[PDB]
Amino acid sequence: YLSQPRLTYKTVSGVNGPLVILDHVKFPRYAEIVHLTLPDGTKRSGQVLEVSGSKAVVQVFEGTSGIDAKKTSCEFTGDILRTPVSEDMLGRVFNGSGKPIDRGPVVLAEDFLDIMGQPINPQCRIYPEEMIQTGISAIDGMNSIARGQKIPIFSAAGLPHNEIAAQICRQAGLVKKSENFAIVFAAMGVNMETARFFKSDFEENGSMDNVCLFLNLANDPTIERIITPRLALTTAEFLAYQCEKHVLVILTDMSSYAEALREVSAAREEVPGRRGFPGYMYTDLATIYERAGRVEGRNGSITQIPILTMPNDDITHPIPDLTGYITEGQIYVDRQLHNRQIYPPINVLPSLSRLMKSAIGEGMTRKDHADVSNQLYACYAIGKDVQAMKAVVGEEALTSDDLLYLEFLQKFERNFIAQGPYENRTVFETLDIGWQLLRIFPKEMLKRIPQSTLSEFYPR
Amino acid sequence: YLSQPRLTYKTVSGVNGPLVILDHVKFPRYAEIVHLTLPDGTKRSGQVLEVSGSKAVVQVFEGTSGIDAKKTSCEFTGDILRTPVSEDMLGRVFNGSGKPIDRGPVVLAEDFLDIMGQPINPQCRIYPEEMIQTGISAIDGMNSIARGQKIPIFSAAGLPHNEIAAQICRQAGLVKKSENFAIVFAAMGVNMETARFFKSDFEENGSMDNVCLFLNLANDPTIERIITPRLALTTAEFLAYQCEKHVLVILTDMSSYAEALREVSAAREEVPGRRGFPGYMYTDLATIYERAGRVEGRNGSITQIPILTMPNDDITHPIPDLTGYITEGQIYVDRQLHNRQIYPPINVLPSLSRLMKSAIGEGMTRKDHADVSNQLYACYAIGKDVQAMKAVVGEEALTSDDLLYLEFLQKFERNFIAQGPYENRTVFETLDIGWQLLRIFPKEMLKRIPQSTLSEFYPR
């Protein structure tokens, strides 16, 4: 118990952008929390980014407008940001800094948890092998997702990534052989109608009893987006590893978070990275993405589905690039498929799931899963490489089998990918449609499928 | 008046680039004017670019070659750059800084005017609607020009933009449905051939008691190209809004102005825009182009015709691209038409005049002007499409109408555009030529002309 009284300094010596600089601080602690009282009486909170001697450099979460350098009072807490955590947080709506925004009381704490986390021994983790049946063929069939993974959705501007996210949240369950997910949902810089969409979708499907929301809208302060994905990931860690439930964490616009990161790094005059983003953005996104999985001895898990929007549909931008080095795959939402009225517009050629090989197969889903997926992928690739020069050089110079790949292209994009915004397919229906599509080709053209599997599944 | 003595400082703190830095100045004033005397007696002039406490940063118009920090003596004027302005300035030749280069005396000033001008209240303007008849059918008939417009010539290096300019100058006048311009000519960075050409053409094809020249050549100070168009435009505003004349301002190679501007910007390490040009190039070109129009209650005007040279014939370069966002149209001079010995080599598709719709029509030129113009545009574009289709599919794969378009193209480029360098076509002759060109097609192909116009003008 910190029982000594706190110190309050009226010694501000600079305001610049999001930062306030103070002098004459007594033994400044790093990462400390500060409470600022403005001249009129309003209160804000900040976190110390750098100490040096007597100086301290606070970042204010709610902006620096209205702050002067003679009558603002900064009270130092003596401790790092520990958030209050409880199990009543399910069914409640908070803002991007954890304050109640639904006419409810403040959180009566079961515990106080550090929001930077606690490192988990790599020897105490468990490898995820339980497949999540999302009910979406493009994911289930070819990019399967294990329970405990971290797999983002690479999207763009104007595309339906919120519909895909909500459908996954609504339909996600385990592969039926014989409870369900709690949901934590952080939104960084969304508009009002996206938040309206998500709230209505959660409470119209009876889920709200089991959902915690942290909402930072585009009219809210920008520097809050830095702590928002960490209060959402500190609740998810209390529920999963202390209350032992299976949590699903959605993090909407992991691009707004990185823009706020760049905005704070540019005000500190630091050696910039690529495109101006901080040079430590990799080590910063990795402390968010790597809070997911199962641990030994505890029956809880955390699955993560971040949602990016690539600037200019560019997958080599710093944000998608660095996110790909950290997460286990990606689901790629394409614009060319959107402009042709396909939903969900998932392009399976740059999509990947790195935990699929160990979550599918005999005894888990079905013995023909991996071979069907591999052959469908190879056929789609060959068909695209055909269609290119078919459009370029000669609609009649096409060979006799260079027309089977085009018919496969059409029927695969219209029958396998295109699903329906409320349709919940099993895994075995997905596999049956895959076989119905593979039956276009004579069985001699399926080189990526063994003979024992072709003999058992092709002739029907 | 300023009745106090002037202060002279030998307190130079450091020379670097084109900037001199003075210390111990007494209440330095921003944008003030300084007179420097060098150790060998030569005299230069500069302008204060920044003040701070006792420091002033002067930018010398002639350069900093030969200045030292012990004997150069700077005398502060006490006021911003004001030019002496009169009405005898018509019929005189000055250099790019305002001194006489025609063996005459200095200007006996009627007034002293600040050369930065003053933005005109947008409520006190009059929308320009009186059409200038330049006698060039490519401008009169398709890109009509009003009296008060600002419309540049987008050319390149080696093309005949100077003769186009001089022809406009010697042919221009109002439209006669049932007295003259005073020219102000500023040239920035021209060679001696161009100045010779313009001087010879003014005093031969007209009168030279109505022209005022400001000649800054290619072997003259670069930083004095920044104040030459402002001297020209201050003279123009005095002659137009106080003596109530109709002025025509010709500013030659705004590209050299923009390049001197880039050089001064790079000298003091400011934020660049595209291709290194300063980020404030739009706000700087707009203080030059926007000093052109009419006002309420005064019987003068200012018609500006800048002349550009696009690097590599690229219209996306920063100079033409930022110029086209500020001015009310442009006249595009083409190289492909010059190589076919066509004069004037004006390509009407990338041309535009934004004040044409309000200057043509019934009671202004003639009832059918706009429809003929739009139909000529449509037919020219379709002809240029067919011309490129036939380069792939050959001469004998075209239809009966594609040959009509290919005939229109030839007759248009040789009868309408091509004019001859001393030919003055009244706008009614231009419209008759346009109708003779439109009668190539049956009246059902002319799908932009209403029927009651085709009933009156097509059969004749």
Binding site: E269, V271, P272, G276 | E269, P272
Partner: peptide, 18 residues
């Protein structure tokens, strides 16, 4: 280029004024 020149300018401002 411009960002690195800015960093160097701030370095050589700090070291001289301090």
């Amino acid at each position: 280029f411009y960002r690195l020149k800015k960093i160097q300018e701030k370095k050589k401002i700090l070291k001289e004024k301090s």
